Amino acid sequence: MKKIAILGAMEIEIQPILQKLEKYETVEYANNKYYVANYNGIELVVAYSKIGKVFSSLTATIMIEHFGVDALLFTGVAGGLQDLQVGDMIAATATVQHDVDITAFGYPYGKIPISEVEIATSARILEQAKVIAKELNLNLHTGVIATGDQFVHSAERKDFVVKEFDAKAIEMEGASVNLICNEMNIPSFILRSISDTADGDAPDNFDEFAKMAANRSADFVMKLVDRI
Amino acid sequence: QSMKKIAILGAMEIEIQPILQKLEKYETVEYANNKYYVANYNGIELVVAYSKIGKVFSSLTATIMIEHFGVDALLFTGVAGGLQDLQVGDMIAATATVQHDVDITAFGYPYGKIPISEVEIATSARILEQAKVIAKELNLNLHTGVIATGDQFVHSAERKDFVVKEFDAKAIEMEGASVNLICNEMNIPSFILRSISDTADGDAPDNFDEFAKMAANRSADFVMKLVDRI
């Protein structure tokens, strides 16, 4: 793993990464910018995808196919489900697409034919992240992260996702990014810090907490790069 | 490179079976957990695949066709639910696409809007005009209009009504807008063709089961007529 992608969805999710690097090259490609740097020995490729499943799919694919990365670390913010609250940070054990619905043909919610409802992340990277978290005296939650192309802000939708998928966080890119990595046989790590709890207060809470959460994730991802 | 390279993309095996049947002979390339079929046809190198259903798989497959296989243009062939005046058996090429299931309205954005992008993404005007000319030459009825995409198989009047009211879409499906957006981002001419298998209401599952292969065959036949006249 000499080339690693660091991916967020929004500019606020990668600004702290670039700030830490200080100097980097900028490559224009696929109607986006990709930032390249030699960071204490590994080549980092950094970008924000733009929001949602399609843009994050594109950007992850380009990082792997065009830039040739060996692994991909996703860093960003999410809504908390169940016991996940503002102040917490979670790495996915697996991802699901909560908005996939082909139940008309007798598939479960979340299931695309020829694929699976849950797609695992890298066990090896996840276990390293857990070791590092304990070293740093920080609590790293782990669990299923759910993804859809909606910003979720209702108890009704939250309860559906929890009941159907047993998810611990909700966001708009993790499952798409993780599935691209799965299909291309690239180790993935999906890290989210909690900005809101995906209920009726979520938009205001996001406005209050998203930058804090973005910085929390970016800080940990760079600690992981320092040791990976 | 001497030959244009064109991608022919469907979502399901049935959507590309008729394409492969017309080639008879092709190379099979395993990549990105899928199969890509490569053949020369009418002096053009065709790269043919089915993506698997939905926005993520179709985004991956289109990106791989462009980035890995180097295609110059992408023609999507498949089936869809008809909205408004569209009926089972009709064919429709998209003028533009929308993602009907995108919802960031919590922050004041319109339905379908991703920040930094646009609600409606155009397809290639040049390819669409060529298709309309060919349909006229062949005395075929080809509709055009906005096609809406989401990661749900739609089978309710309530959802149809929302999509029509919000987006003025004429068809609904699970890959067109994702494929078209990838093409837009990579500056690749796109053509999105759908034939109608159902009308996206409570009868849609049964109608799809009866008519999906018929519709797939119409779209594949027309896409190859288009390729014949490049």
Ligand SMILES: Nc1ncnc2[nH]cnc12
């Ligand atoms: N409630 C929410 N829904 C979707 N994506 C999010 N990202 C942060 N909070 C979110």
Ligand SMILES: Nc1ncnc2[nH]cnc12
């Ligand atoms: N009703 C429908 N919804 C989504 N995709 C389709 N493809 C064919 N019919 C469809």
Ligand code: NA
């Ligand atoms: Na540095």
Ligand code: NA
């Ligand atoms: Na907690």
